């Protein structure tokens, strides 16, 4: 049995502005309808109500995600959230805990590219897009076209990884149609990340032609 | 306690013609003992000497490799590799085995690309690479300069992520200093790849400029 607790997107703590955490607790194979799941600051102030998602995976396991929403101020300012997790044959029960990482900060460099026609694809592009050097890791990333955001299931982007520095780097790829740049050919690779002044945006326009 | 058994490089199949497999061993808590790999064929069929290697990490995990070289014929034609696993205090025995991936084929596309200079540090630009659209997974990607490969540690290859079509992508990022492009301005990607005819290689040049 094993518990995972991340920390909120950049994009929901800094655009939308409801930031929400999720604990989730995999590798549950047997069953004894009781894995409690039990959520708390470390400041001791009140949290709020969870939602709670158990999923039997075709795999022989069992999943149960929680999701918490925090304050946008109380995870800005440092503070800690925290999933405790007592399954019914539990030795221990597991502690898992989560904060804003600290560091020092360092806003994304941000590069958009279009790529050439490939033969049996007339009617589609792949757009690329480099966000680098940024710290600490945590990164959304958004794609914009005629002012106004495209759906997420659209584009993917890498997990973070190291630059030979002391930043990261993720790539997003966005497959576009011939429709889209004809209608508007102008499409926005922006990167929400905190170290980005002000408003945590840097973005950048690429073209098709 | 968690085992892995890798498949063989597409570069050092195809093109070094010595393509070796990898039996991965990751000890979460370091018993005193000694692990075991041991190595067959499905066949039955005698085994070349293998390396194995120990390191306990900077986290307080051991981790244990053996690496086998195999056949490039016995390989090709679907031989099946297996690593049996040993542990001092191994309740059973783990086993890991590896053989040709035989699904659909497609070759990969590759495109290269170079950033334009960051203010203020135009000692240096990143470069990179986009492979997508192949199958299966297994990819070799490397960068060269005057028709020379460079050091594996000086990019970064991001893991086969699955595309919206059928196939995967992978990006690539090297950083190159000015002294370089200078030197001569022209740095070659290169995909090894399964399906890549016309010699399972295809690979896409760029210029700082
Ligand atoms: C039985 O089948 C089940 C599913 O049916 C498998 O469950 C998956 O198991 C893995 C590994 O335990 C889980 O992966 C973990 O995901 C965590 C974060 O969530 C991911 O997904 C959300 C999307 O909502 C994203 O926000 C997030 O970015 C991740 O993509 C990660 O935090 C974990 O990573 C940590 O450990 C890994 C090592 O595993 C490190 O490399 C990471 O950097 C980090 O330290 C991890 O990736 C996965 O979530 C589970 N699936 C589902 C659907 O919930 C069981 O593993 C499988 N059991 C067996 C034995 O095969």
């Given at each position: 049995?094993?518990?995972?607790?991340?920390?909120?997107?950049?994009?929901?703590?800094?655009?939308?502005?409801?930031?929400?955490?999720?604990?989730?607790?995999?590798?549950?194979?047997?069953?004894?309808?009781?894995?409690?799941?039990?959520?708390?600051?470390?400041?001791?102030?009140?949290?709020?109500?969870?939602?709670?998602?158990?999923?039997?995976?075709?795999?022989?396991?069992?999943?149960?995600?929680?999701?918490?929403?925090?304050?946008?101020?109380?995870?800005?300012?440092?503070?800690?959230?925290?999933?405790?997790?007592?399954?019914?044959?539990?030795?221990?029960?597991?502690?898992?805990?989560?904060?804003?990482?600290?560091?020092?900060?360092?806003?994304?460099?941000?590069?958009?590219?279009a790529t050439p026609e490939?033969?049996?694809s007339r009617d589609k592009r792949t757009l690329?897009?480099?966000?680098?050097?940024?710290?600490?890791?945590?990164?959304?990333?958004?794609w914009l076209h005629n002012?106004?955001?495209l759906?997420?299931?659209?584009?993917?982007?890498?997990?973070?990884?190291?630059?030979?520095?002391?930043?990261?780097?993720?790539?997003?790829?966005l497959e576009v149609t011939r429709a889209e740049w004809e209608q508007k050919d102008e499409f926005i690779?922006?990167?929400?990340?905190?170290?980005?002044?002000?408003?945590?945006?840097?973005?950048?326009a690429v073209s098709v032609n």
């Amino acid at each position: 049995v094993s518990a995972y607790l991340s920390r909120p997107s950049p994009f929901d703590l800094f655009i939308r502005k409801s930031p929400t955490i999720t604990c989730l607790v995999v590798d549950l194979a047997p069953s004894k309808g009781t894995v409690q799941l039990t959520w708390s600051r470390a400041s001791g102030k009140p949290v709020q109500h969870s939602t709670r998602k158990e999923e039997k995976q075709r795999n022989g396991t069992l999943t149960v995600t929680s999701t918490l929403p925090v304050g946008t101020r109380d995870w800005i300012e440092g503070e800690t959230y925290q999933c405790r997790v007592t399954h019914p044959h539990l030795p221990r029960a597991l502690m898992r805990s989560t904060t804003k990482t600290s560091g020092p900060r360092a806003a994304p460099e941000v590069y958009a590219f279009a790529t050439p026609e490939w033969p049996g694809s007339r009617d589609k592009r792949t757009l690329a897009c480099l966000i680098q050097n940024f710290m600490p890791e945590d990164i959304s990333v958004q794609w914009l076209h005629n002012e106004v955001q495209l759906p997420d299931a659209r584009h993917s982007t890498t997990q973070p990884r190291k630059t030979k520095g002391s930043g990261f780097f993720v790539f997003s790829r966005l497959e576009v149609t011939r429709a889209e740049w004809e209608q508007k050919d102008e499409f926005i690779c922006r990167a929400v990340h905190e170290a980005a002044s002000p408003s945590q945006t840097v973005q950048r326009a690429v073209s098709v032609n």
